[PDB]
Amino acid sequence: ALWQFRSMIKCAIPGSHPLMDFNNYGCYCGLGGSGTPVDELDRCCETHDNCYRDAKNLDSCKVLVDNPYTESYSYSCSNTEITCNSKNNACEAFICNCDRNAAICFSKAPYNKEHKNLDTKKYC
Amino acid sequence: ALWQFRSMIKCAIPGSHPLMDFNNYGCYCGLGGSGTPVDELDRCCETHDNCYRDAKNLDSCKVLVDNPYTESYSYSCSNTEITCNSKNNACEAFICNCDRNAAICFSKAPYNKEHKNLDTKKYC
Ligand SMILES: [Ca+2]
Ligand SMILES: [Ca+2]
Ligand SMILES: [Ca+2]
């Protein structure tokens, strides 16, 4: 669930303010995604968006989960490392994974303040 | 999640058709619940209805869980026994239990074919 994803980003990026820093950044980080991602951080959001789309194609996600952004999974934050519980169901494990990889992705991408709140009709 | 509860009913009552047999039975098995339950099977539905109402008032569920009929959990069916997996968080464990106790409840109550499709306006 989204609240878990916000906590994974604080895990990997201590002292980050997830909603404030990464929402509405470039063409993909936020409600939609269209156009060409404008940097490596936007590309992280674009993969996370496709990750969620692919999860919805799994049979497991179809019968068991309604909304990925609301579905709680099991993961842990050890120090700065994220781990998805091996005992999560197959749909929960796929979501957990998408989130884990995005979080690790954001921790290595450079942040471009200029891309924050970019006009999505103009540039995307 | 509802698909999981249907599955636990077929675990405990091998060969039942959960929607066909248990939906729209007495006063509580179905969308609503009002009145006095008409029999033991109906009291199972009633308890499961209250179970979920309590689930919602659980802090970890309270704010952190969208809707309990939607949240997926981990459980397993061994032969005819249901087990809620220990990986589940407070919210999911609570849900899985509401579900597990109802399926066991159903497996033990007597079924009055005469209460299937009881007029809810008239009798509840
Ligand atoms: Ca997006
Ligand atoms: Ca009911
Ligand atoms: Ca779950």
Swiss-Prot record, chains A, B:
Disulfide bonds: C11-C77, C27-C124, C29-C45, C44-C105, C51-C98, C61-C91, C84-C96
Cofactor note: Binds 1 Ca(2+) ion per subunit.
Reported modifications of this chain: Acylation causes dimerization. Activated by trypsin cleavage in the duodenum. Can also be activated by thrombin or autocatalytically.
BP terms from Gene Ontology: cellular response to insulin stimulus; fatty acid biosynthetic process; intracellular signal transduction; leukotriene biosynthetic process; lipid catabolic process; neutrophil chemotaxis; neutrophil mediated immunity; phosphatidylcholine metabolic process
N6-palmitoyl lysine lipid sites: K56
Required co-factors: Ca(2+)
Activity-regulation annotation: Regulated by bile acid salts. Up-regulated by cholate and down-regulated by taurochenodeoxycholate.
Keywords: Autocatalytic cleavage, Calcium, Disulfide bond, Hydrolase, Lipid metabolism, Lipoprotein, Metal-binding, Palmitate, Phospholipid metabolism, Pyrrolidone carboxylic acid, Secreted, Signal, Zymogen
Compartment annotation: Secreted
Residues bound to Ca(2+): Y28, G30, G32, D49
Keyword Transport: no
Known partners and oligomeric status: Monomer or homodimer.
Its biological purpose: Secretory calcium-dependent phospholipase A2 that primarily targets dietary phospholipids in the intestinal tract. Hydrolyzes the ester bond of the fatty acyl group attached at sn-2 position of phospholipids (phospholipase A2 activity) with preference for phosphatidylethanolamines and phosphatidylglycerols over phosphatidylcholines. May play a role in the biosynthesis of N-acyl ethanolamines that regulate energy metabolism and inflammation in the intestinal tract.
Protein family membership: Belongs to the phospholipase A2 family.
Other remarks on this protein: Loss of activity upon alkylation of His-48 with p-bromo phenacyl bromide; Ca(2+) and Ba(2+) protect against inactivation.
Protein name: Phospholipase A2, major isoenzyme
Organism: Sus scrofa
Lineage per the UniProt record: Eukaryota, Metazoa, Chordata, Craniata, Vertebrata
Portion of the full-length sequence here: 23 to 146 of 146
